[PDB]
Amino acid sequence: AAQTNAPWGLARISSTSPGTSTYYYDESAGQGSCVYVIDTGIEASHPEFEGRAQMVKTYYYSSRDGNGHGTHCAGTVGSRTYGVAKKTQLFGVKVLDDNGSGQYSTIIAGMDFVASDKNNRNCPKGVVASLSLGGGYSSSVNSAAARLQSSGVMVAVAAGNNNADARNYSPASEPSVCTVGASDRYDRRSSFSNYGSVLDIFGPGTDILSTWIGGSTRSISGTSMATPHVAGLAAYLMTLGKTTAASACRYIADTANKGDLSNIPFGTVNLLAYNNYQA
């Protein structure tokens, strides 16, 4: 399948070169997979989600996304126009309030929720969780991410936006999950992207167009935006049967575009997520 005039990040993930604008992907499109977006919620009523999104859990007075961030991330995973995996099922878990903040204890509860809740959902092709959040190092946060991964969920987490080594942030520093840095449309490391040995992969993160609340759209930047590209890619690849939740991060690294990013510090991987789709 070919989506013309796609957001640059979608085009980038199906291309061996920057500077194109068509997204190419297998029509299976993540059907039969599920992606949990653990964030500020999801505006499931947005036409871009086509009935494939729903809120399953909140820790606050509403499950609605009063912020936009979670809706944007969910859009990059799976919206019809802005998403990598256009037929996946999206499940929202609101661990962050409408100002985008959340306690680590709530975030941990949300991760353990997903590890169990997937047994209440139909995801024959596999389960992914996208975590566009983080703060300072916490062994308990890292352990919760490790549990979620161990339970059979492909966990993708943001590297962080501090232009610093991600070893000092969580859950980015957890070795067993997929830690995602951000790049721009010219294959440069995003100016804010964290780096370091704990990163597994880069995805598009600067000037990413996606869904927003109030049935709208907007372009924002962050490792928050790169993470759902990788989560959606994992769901897409798992639906194709090319990899599994336990092996998807490594498979994405194995098949990535290699050596193509600039300003990658010595010791950080130079790997850009790539679907290797031959039309």
From Swiss-Prot:
Determine the domain of life of the protein's source.
Eukaryota
**From the UniProt record, which GO molecular function terms apply?**
metal ion binding; serine-type endopeptidase activity
Record flagged with keyword Transcription: no
Q: What is annotated as the active site?
A: 39, 69, 224
What is written in the cofactor note of this entry?
A: Binds 2 calcium ions per subunit.
Q: What is its EC number?
A: 3.4.21.64
Q: Which family does it belong to?
A: Belongs to the peptidase S8 family.
Q: Which organism is it from?
A: Parengyodontium album
Q: What keywords tag this UniProt record?
A: Calcium, Disulfide bond, Hydrolase, Metal-binding, Protease, Serine protease, Signal, Zymogen
Keyword RNA-binding applies: no
> What is the designated name of this protein?
Proteinase K
Tell me the residue numbers annotated for binding Ca(2+) 2. Answer: 16, 260
Name the coenzymes or cofactors required: Ca(2+)
